[PDB]
Design a protein around this ligand. Structure first.
Ligand SMILES: CC(=O)O[C@H](C(=O)O)c1ccccc1Cl
Ligand SMILES: CC(=O)O[C@H](C(=O)O)c1ccccc1Cl
Lengths: 319, 319
C-alpha cells in the first residue's frame, strides 16, 4: 500500500484496497474483472451535471459502431469535438465507468466528446479496436454535422490504453492523410509492450495498477509478438520520421505509475520529431487518478482535470 | 409563481422560473421542448452512485425496442425487477433526464429497473408507446434471466404519463392474462383525457406543469377522441369490473398538481374494485417533485422517494 510521496487521499485509498484484499484482478474472468471497475466507480457520489448525452450508431469499418456523444448542456451550434477512447487494459471499461472523467473534460473544454464503444478483449484482439477507433474518428470528421459538431475541429483523447488508442489513431490519421486532427490528449498512456522501464520495476505492486495486470492486459489484447512490435500497438517504437507531423500533444503522467516512463519517453520521441508537446508529471498520483471516482475530488486531480479541459479548449478554437 | 402552502424550496424554484421567463413550453417545437427538460436536469449536481446501467435491445411488438437495465451495484444473483416508464407528456423525456429518479428507486428498493425507450409523440401516436411498453414487460417476464432478473417478481412504475403507462400496462397484462405483476407504482399519474377537475382549475398556471402543457401533450399523443375514451388512454374511465384483480398500487400525488384529482380518483376507483391501494398526497409539492433534479434534495422529496423505493422492495420479495 503506497510509497512515500503518495498524495494523502490517494494513499488512504491504497491502504483501503489492501485492507480486505481480494484476488489479483488478473486471476478473474473478464466478466468478473469488468464488475470490479463497475462496482468501484459506482461506490461514490460524483458530479455529472452540465452535460447531455445521446447515443448514435454508425456504419464504418464495414461495421456497426456505437457512439456516446457527450455535449455541454444548453449550447446551440456546431461545437468543436474530441474523440474519447476509454482505458481498462482493453479488457475493462465502457462509457458509464468513464463517464465522470468524460464529463469533466467536456464541461472544462466546452467541446463535445464522442465516446467510441470499441470491442473489448479478449472478445476481439488487436487491431480490431483501433480500426474501429480510427473509423469512428474519420466518420465524425466527415459527418459531424449529423451530431451537431464541427468535424474540422477535431481532437483525440483518452486514458491508459485509451491514451494508447488516441496516440495510434493520430498515427493512423497521419498515415492515411486524413482526417485533420487539432490535438491529441494522452492521459497516462500505454505506449510500449515492454515491461522493463524503471517505473515498471519501481511500482510493480501496491499502486493499484500492477505489472501483473499490465501483462495480462496485453496478453488479452494480443499474444502475437510481431503485432506488439508494430507502431500501431507500441507507438514508442516509432521513428522520428514516422512521428513527424503529428498533432500537438498534452501528455499527463502519474509519478507512481508503471506506465510513467514509457509515457514520458513517447513525449520525448514526439519532441525529437519536431511535434509540439507538453509533458507534465503529476507527482503523488497513481495510475488513473483522473478516472477513479473515489479520487475525483482530490485537489491535485481537479487541477489535472482543469488543465486537460483547458488545453482541449485552446486547440479547438475557430481559425 | 406558486400558492400559499408550497414547500419553501419548491416555491423558490417556481419564482426563479417566472424570473427571466421564456415562451410557454407548448409554443416550442418538440425538439426544442425536449432541450428544455434536458437542460434543466443537467443544471444541477445530483447523486447517481450505487447503480450499474447496461443497454439491451429486444425484439418484441414486431419491433426493436431499446432497454436501459439499471441494477444495484455489486449484487450477484437474479434480482426482482420493475419496469420503468418515463414521463414528459409523451413528447418529452428519455433515460438521462429520468436517470436520477430511477437511480433513487433502484438503490432504495434493491430491485432492478428496466427503462423502456418507447417512441415519442408526435413521431408516433397512441397506442404505439403503450404497445411497446406492454411488449417489453412481457419480454422481461419471459426472458429476464438474460438480463439477470427474476421475471416472475415483476412490477411496473412511472411518473406522469409514465404513470399513465404503468397503469395501462397493468390493464393490458390483466386483459391478456399475462404476465403476473406484483405491484404498480404510480407517481403523480395522468389518468384521464379531461381537463375539468378542481385541481386542473386551481393550478392551471404557475406551478410548472400547466393546463396548456397538458392539452398540448395529449394533442401530440392523439387527437382521436375515440382513442382518448379508451381505458388504455384514459384509465379513469374503466369500470369496477375492468379494474378488478389489478395488482397492488402505491399512488403518490402532489398537492399543487393539475393531475392531482384524477390521480386520487383513479386510486378511489381501484379501491372500489377491491384492488389493494395506498393513496398518498404529498402536500407542498408540485408535479414531478420526484423527477426535477433541482428539487432532488428537498426533504419532502427525499421522504417520498424513500417511500417509493421501500414499497417496491416490500412487493418484490421471495414467496
Ligand atoms: C495555436 C494554438 O494552438 O495555441 C497553442 C498554445 O497557446 O499553447 C499553441 C499550439 C501549438 C503551437 C504553439 C501554440 Cl502557442
Ligand atoms: C403481502 C405483501 O405484499 O405485503 C404488503 C404490505 O405489507 O403492505 C401487502 C400487500 C397487499 C396486501 C396486504 C399486504 Cl400486508
Amino acid at each position: 500500500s503506497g510509497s512515500p510521496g503518495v498524495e494523502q487521499h490517494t494513499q488512504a485509498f491504497l491502504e483501503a484496497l489492501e485492507q480486505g484484499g481480494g484476488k489479483p484482478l488478473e486471476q478473474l474472468s473478464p466478466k468478473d474483472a469488468r464488475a470490479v471497475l463497475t462496482g468501484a466507480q459506482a461506490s461514490v457520489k460524483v458530479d455529472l451535471s452540465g452535460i447531455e448525452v445521446k447515443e448514435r450508431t454508425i456504419q464504418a469499418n464495414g461495421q456497426s459502431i456505437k457512439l456516446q456523444v457527450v455535449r455541454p448542456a444548453n449550447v446551440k451550434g456546431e461545437l468543436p469535438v474530441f474523440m474519447f477512447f476509454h482505458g481498462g487494459g482493453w479488457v475493462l471499461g465502457d462509457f458509464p465507468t468513464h463517464q465522470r472523467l468524460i464529463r469533466d473534460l467536456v464541461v472544462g473544454s466546452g467541446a463535445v466528446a464522442v465516446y467510441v464503444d470499441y470491442t473489448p478483449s479478449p472478445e476481439s484482439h488487436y487491431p480490431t479496436a483501433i480500426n474501429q477507433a480510427y473509423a469512428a474518428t474519420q466518420w465524425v470528421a466527415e459527418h459531424g454535422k449529423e451530431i451537431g459538431v464541427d468535424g474540422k475541429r477535431l481532437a483525440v483523447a483518452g486514458n491508459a490504453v485509451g491514451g494508447n488508442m488516441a496516440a495510434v489513431v493520430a498515427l493512423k490519421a497521419k498515415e492515411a492523410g486524413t482526417p485533420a486532427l487539432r490535438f491529441q490528449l494522452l492521459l497516462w498512456p500505454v505506449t510500449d509492450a515492454s515491461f522493463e522501464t524503471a517505473s515498471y520495476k519501481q511500482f510493480a505492486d501496491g499502486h493499484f495498477l500492477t505489472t501483473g495486470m499490465m501483462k495480462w492486459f496485453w496478453d488479452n489484447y494480443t499474444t502475437d509478438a510481431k503485432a506488439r512490435e508494430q507502431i500501431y500497438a507500441s507507438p514508442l517504437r516509432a521513428s522520428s520520421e514516422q512521428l513527424k507531423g503529428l498533432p500537438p500533444a498534452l501528455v499527463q503522467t502519474a509519478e507512481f505509475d508503471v506506465l510513467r516512463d514509457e509515457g514520458e519517453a513517447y513525449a520525448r520521441k514526439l519532441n525529437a520529431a519536431g511535434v509540439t508537446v507538453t509533458s507534465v508529471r503529476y507527482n503523488g498520483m497513481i495510475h488513473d487518478y483522473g478516472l477513479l471516482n473515489p479520487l475525483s475530488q482530490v485537489p491535485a486531480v481537479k487541477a489535472a482535470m482543469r488543465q486537460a479541459g483547458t488545453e482541449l479548449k485552446v486547440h479547438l478554437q475557430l481559425e
